[PDB]
């Protein structure tokens, strides 16, 4: 269509400036700088409302408008309240040992399924790890927190064994805000 | 080439023309009409100057009818000092006297006639008008 628009109201967040389509959203919790060069959308800021508009876009290009609205709300939620993931360890026989170094940006996993190899993972920037067998992933970027959970889950994978019997692994339990 | 001149009269084929000799030093000469760019500058009054004595015979060269020519003394001959008749000088001075007052009256034209036309970078003569 010629005009497809979505409207969002901005919260009390400090700066939402969009220089070079790059949203440098700074709020009470922190700063999240992300690019919107992947979408060709006129989003206009006036007063306390922002309008995402696409002109002459087809169905494929018009589908990304709601995705932009979803993500723009996402780091608004991140810079206001933040994102926290609670992730519980499941093991049958061998307890899983987890160590956090330099305030949790590196997580070391040992004794997974009885293996002697130490699995060390570097979390994405802006995410910190804490021990509540519960792991808490808190940060500003939902992108980085979810990715860090994905990396941990993929790293603690069972190989060449029957999943039907071996239910060991690490799966996310709760995804909420601080 | 590049001089600015004032047309006196139209001869059989060319134009009898002179940029005032006291302005740019171009004497009375015939110039073929295909080798001039006429300008849109304000006209100079040439009604008061005699143009009947400027003819092909007046500008005619001396007949030679022989292949012998050229010499260092030959080049030492001719020149403005020699050759140039006093009557030709008087005619140049007379036309100057009858032409200068008009270009004095209209501003900037005296020094315009003194200057020399030239093309510069980016100048496109088809777009340019004179």
């Amino acid at each position: 269509d010629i005009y497809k628009d979505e409207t969002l109201t901005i919260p009390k967040g400090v700066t939402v400036d969009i220089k070079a389509r790059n949203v440098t959203v700074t709020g009470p919790r922190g700063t999240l700088k992300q690019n919107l060069r992947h979408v060709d959308i006129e989003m206009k800021k006036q007063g306390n409302t922002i309008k995402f508009i696409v002109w002459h876009g087809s169905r494929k290009h018009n589908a990304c408008i709601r995705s932009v609205y979803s993500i723009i709300n996402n780091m608004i939620i991140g810079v206001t309240q933040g994102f926290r993931y609670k992730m519980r360890l499941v093991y049958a026989h061998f307890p899983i040992n987890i160590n956090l170094t330099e305030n949790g940006t590196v997580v070391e996993i040992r004794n997974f399924l009885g293996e002697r190899i130490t699995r060390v993972i570097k979390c994405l920037p802006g995410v910190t790890v804490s021990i509540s067998d519960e792991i808490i992933l808190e940060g500003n970027s939902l992108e980085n927190v979810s990715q860090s959970a994905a990396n941990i889950k993929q790293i603690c994978n069972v190989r060449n064994k029957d999943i039907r019997k071996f239910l060991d692994g690490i799966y996310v339990s709760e995804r909420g805000n601080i | 080439r590049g001089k600015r001149v004032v047309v006196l009269s139209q001869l059989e084929d060319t134009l009898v023309v002179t940029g005032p000799y006291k302005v740019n030093g171009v004497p009375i000469r015939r110039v073929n009409h295909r080798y001039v760019i006429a300008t849109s500058a304000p006209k100079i009054d040439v009604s008061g100057v005699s143009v009947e004595k400027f003819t092909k015979a007046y500008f005619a060269k001396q007949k030679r009818s022989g292949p012998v020519k050229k010499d260092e003394a030959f080049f030492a001959e001719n020149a403005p000092k020699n050759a140039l008749p006093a009557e030709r000088i008087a005619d140049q001075k007379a036309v100057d006297a009858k032409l200068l007052p008009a270009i004095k009256a209209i501003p900037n034209m005296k020094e315009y006639l003194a200057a020399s036309f030239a093309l510069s970078n980016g100048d496109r003569p088809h777009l340019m008008k004179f």
């Binding site: - | 080439r1 760019i37 020399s116 030239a118 093309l119 100048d123 496109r124 088809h126 004179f130």
Partner: protein, 106 residues
């Protein structure tokens, strides 16, 4: 030094040719600032020349000139066809030419 150049700068592009057959009798010339055949109409019939320099002194001159005339426009991009008294050497492709303002009609 900008009180001269009563000519317009041009470049010898190529001979008049088909895909494989050249015709060196007439040449293709790109006059600077001439961007259409309507503009080429002004330059039709002008006197174009190729000026080059030689070691031998012909009549006491280091500079010798081949003269020619713009004949017709060529294409839509302002290129013109030029006929010279001596066909321009094929080594001049990309060399410069002087297009005078005479025979003038402006």
């Amino acid at each position: 030094a900008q009180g001269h150049r009563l000519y317009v700068k041009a470049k010898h592009l190529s001979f008049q040719r088909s895909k494989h057959v050249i015709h060196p009798g007439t040449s293709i010339v790109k006059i600077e600032g001439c961007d259409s055949k309507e503009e080429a109409q002004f330059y039709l019939g002008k006197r174009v020349c190729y000026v080059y320099k030689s070691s031998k002194a012909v009549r006491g001159s280091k500079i010798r000139v081949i003269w020619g005339t713009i004949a017709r426009p060529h294409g839509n991009s302002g290129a013109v066809r030029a006929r010279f008294v001596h066909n321009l050497p094929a080594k001049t492709f990309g060399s410069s030419l002087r297009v005078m303002l005479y025979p003038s009609n402006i």
